Symmetry: C3
C-alpha cells in the first residue's frame, strides 16, 4: 500500500485490516503510532470541512506537522501543473500528500511522485477514506457485511461516495440497491434501482447523499425543485418510522436539511451521521499508518 | 465558565478575575497553563488580523494545536449550516471553537454544541475579548474604573466594541459618553451623546472607533466625506494637545489613518493602541484557561 | 545581519557564510539550531508555492511555530496598511516576519519594525533567498564562481530573480550574459545581451525565467505568442544537446512547460530545477539562524 487512490485497488483483506486498526485506535486497544519528524501537505483543490479537518486531526495526533497549501494563494496562478506542485512538495521534504482535486483520475498524472498519496476525492470518481469510514461504522454496528441490505438514495452518477461504497460493499457480500431521480441513474453500476417505499421496511442501512449541485449543468440546476425531490427521494418522518429497530441512517455530509433528509432526523436515535465524522479521524489514522509504516 | 459570548453574561467579579489572571500571565507572577493534547478550531467568517492571530498566539503558547478552517474553502459552499459546521468540529475531537460571524447573536443557534465557544465577534452585537483586553489596559494604566470619564467616538450603532465596552464600563462604575455622527447614534445605549470639544479637556480615556463601512448601506457610503468626518469626530493635533497629562488614547484597530485619528498620533506618548494588541494575547490566554479548565 | 531585504546589502563574505552554513545543515556536518519558543508570521501578499512552503519547512525544522496570515481574510480589507499589519504582528509576540509584497521596495515603509524581516520578494525588485539558494546550488556543483559563464534567459526587466542574481554573480566574479525579447531588456543591468545560439556551447550555467504575465501591461499580453517565444528564447532539444558535459540548467520555478523550457528537459540529467527547491529549505534555515542568532 504505497498510495490510497481507489477502492478498486483494495482487497477485502486490506479493508478489514484498515477497519480493525481504526476500531482498535478508537477503543484504546491499540496505541497510536508516533511519526514525529515527518511532514504532510493537504492539497484541497475542492472545498472540504470533514475530510480536510479530520485528516489534519489524524496527522497532528500521530505527531506529523503540516505544510500549509491554499490553492488560491499558491503558484498554481503562475501556471504550475498538479505534477509540478506535488514534485515540489516532495523536493522540499514532505513525506505524504493528501489531495482532493476536481479532475476524475487526477492521480494518473502523478506516477513519478515518490512519496505516498492519499486521495481525498477525485471529482465524481473515488472517495476511499469516506468508503472505509462508512464500512468501519457498519462493522462497529453489526460485526459483518454479508447479506446486509443497503439502500443508497440520491445523486448517484455524480457521487464519488456512491461509486466507492458500491464497489466495496458488493465485494464484502452486501446487497446494494439505489434510489435515484432518472437524471442521476449511473449505468456503470450494476445494482437494482428501486423506489424507497418498496424496500424501506426491509433495509438494514439507508445511506443518503447530498445533491452535487456544483457538479451539475445548467438544465439540471434551472429545473431543480427541492420540495418535489424531498417527496420522492428524501428521508421524511413516514419513511424513518418504517425502519427496522436495528437499521441505521448514514450520510457522508454535509447535509442539506429538508432536501435528502428531514432536519430533525439528522440526530435521531438511528442516525450515525455525526458518528461517521468521529470514525473518520480513526480510519484516517489507520490509512496514514499503512502509508508511512 | 462554559462559553464567552456577551459582556451581558459576565459579572464584574468575573471581569476582575480575567483581567488579574491576564496581568499575572503577562508579568510572569503566574506561570502559563499547559493544555498539550487539546485542539482548537478558529472559525473566522468575517475578516480579522488581531483577534485571529492573537487567539492563535495564545492557543500555541498554552500548547494547543489548531485545526485549519478557512470559510471560503470549507463545505459551507455545499450548503452546510453554522450549527452543522460546529457540531462536525466537535465530532472530530475539537475541544474549543473561536467564532467570528456576520450574524448578530449567531451563538443562539449553537445551544446543542457541547464544547466551549469564544465569541470573536457577532456582527454589530458583542466583542467580549476586545472589551476585556480594553478593561485590562485601563486597569494596568490606573488600577480602578469607578468615576473614570470615558469618551467613545465614531460609528456607535454599528460597533460590537462600543456595545460590549458601554455595558462593562457602566457596570464597573465608569462615566461613559459617546460622540457620533447623527446617522450612527445608538438609541439602545443610555449614555449622553456629546461634542468631543465640550469634554476632551476632562476625559481620562478617549476610545476611537473605525467606521464600519462594510456594515453600512448605499446611502451612507455614497455621502461619506473623510475630511469632514475628521474635522467633526476625529482625534487631531488640537484635540490631542487638550488631553490631561494622565489621559490615554485607545482604538480596537485596525486604524484608518487621517479619518478617526491623525496618522502621527497612533504611536504618540498617550496612545495605548499597540499596547492593547499585546494585552489581547494575555487576556485570550486567561479566557482559554477559564474555558478549558 | 538584522534583516535580509536585498543582495545589494550583502558582502561576498556574508554570501559564503550563508551558502556554507546551508550546505553543512544539508550534509549533516552542522546540527540544526533549536529556536523552540519563537514565533514567525509568513505574510504572502503575492502567490507562492516554493518560497512560502520551504520557509515553513525551514521554520518548523528549527522548532519555530507559525502564526497563520492569509491576506484575503486579514483586516487589510478594513484598510490596514502594511506597516500596521507588521507592527501588529510584532506587538502580539512574533520574532520574525517573512514578507512577499507586490510593491518594489515595500520594506522602506518598515523602518520602525523592531523584529527581523526576510524579503520573500518585493514586486520586480529583489528575491534574496532565491539568489542565495541559486548560488548555493552553483557552489555545490563547481566549488567556485570566478570566471563562470552564466546565461540568464527570458523576462529580465520584470524579474526580481534576474536582478538579485546579476548583482551577486557579478560581485563573486562570474561572467553574466542575458538573452531577452527586446521588450524585456533591462537597461539598469550592465551585462551583454546575446542570442542563446551564439553562447550556448560555451556557457557553464543556463538559468531560465518564467514570463511574468501577471506583471505585464495590456499591449504585451495581447501580442504574446508562446510558440514564437519558445523558438527564440526557450531551452529546446537542440540547445540542450549543445551544453558542455559539466553544464547545468536552473529555473527558480514554477515552470511553464513548452514555453521557456521543453517539458521533458525539466528532469533531464543536467537540470538542477528540483535540486534548487530542496536546497532552498537549507538556505532558508541558514537565513533564519543568521536573523534569530
Ligand atoms: O457527499 C458530498 O456531498 C460531499 C462529500 N463529502 C465529504 O467528503 C465531506 P467534506 O466535503 O466536508 O470533506 C464529498 O464527496 O466530498
Ligand atoms: O471595529 C473595528 O474596526 C474592527 C474590530 N476590531 C477587531 O477585533 C480587530 P481585527 O478585525 O483585526 O481582529 C471588530 O469589531 O472586529
Ligand atoms: O520566477 C518566477 O516566475 C516567480 C519566482 N519564483 C519563486 O520565488 C517561486 P514561488 O513563487 O513558488 O515561491 C518569484 O519571483 O517569486
Amino acid at each position: 500500500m504505497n498510495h490510497l487512490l481507489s477502492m478498486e485497488h483494495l482487497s477485502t483483506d486490506q479493508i478489514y485490516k484498515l477497519i480493525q486498526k481504526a476500531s482498535q485506535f478508537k477503543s484504546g486497544e491499540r496505541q497510536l503510532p508516533n511519526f514525529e519528524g515527518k511532514y504532510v501537505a493537504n492539497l484541497f483543490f475542492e472545498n472540504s470541512t470533514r475530510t480536510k479537518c479530520s485528516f489534519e486531526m489524524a496527522e497532528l495526533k500521530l505527531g506529523l506537522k503540516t505544510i500549509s497549501f491554499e490553492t488560491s494563494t499558491s503558484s498554481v496562478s503562475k501556471g504550475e501543473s498538479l505534477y509540478d506542485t506535488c514534485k515540489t512538495l516532495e523536493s522540499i521534504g514532505c513525506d505524504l500528500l493528501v489531495i482532493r482535486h476536481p479532475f476524475n483520475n487526477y492521480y494518473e498524472k502523478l506516477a513519478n511522485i515518490n512519496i505516498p498519496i492519499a486521495n481525498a476525492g477525485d471529482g465524481s470518481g473515488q472517495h476511499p477514506t469516506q468508503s472505509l469510514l462508512d464500512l468501519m461504522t457498519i462493522y462497529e454496528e453489526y460485526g459483518y457485511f454479508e447479506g446486509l441490505n443497503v439502500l443508497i438514495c440520491g445523486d448517484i452518477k455524480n457521487s464519488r461516495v456512491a461509486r466507492s461504497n458500491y464497489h466495496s460493499l458488493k465485494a464484502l457480500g452486501a446487497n446494494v440497491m439505489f434510489n435515484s431521480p432518472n437524471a442521476w441513474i449511473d449505468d456503470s453500476l450494476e445494482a437494482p434501482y428501486v423506489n424507497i417505499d418498496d424496500v424501506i421496511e426491509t433495509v438494514d442501512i439507508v445511506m443518503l447523499l447530498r445533491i452535487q449541485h456544483e457538479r451539475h449543468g445548467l438544465a439540471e440546476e434551472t429545473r431543480f425543485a427541492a420540495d418535489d425531490y424531498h417527496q420522492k427521494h428524501g428521508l421524511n418522518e413516514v419513511r424513518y418510522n418504517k425502519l427496522q429497530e436495528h437499521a441505521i441512517v448514514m450520510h457522508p455530509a454535509p447535509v442539506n436539511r429538508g432536501v435528502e433528509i428531514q432536519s430533525d432526523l439528522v440526530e435521531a436515535s438511528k442516525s450515525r451521521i455525526f458518528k461517521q465524522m468521529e470514525n473518520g479521524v480513526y480510519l484516517r489514522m489507520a490509512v496514514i499508518d499503512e502509508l508511512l509504516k
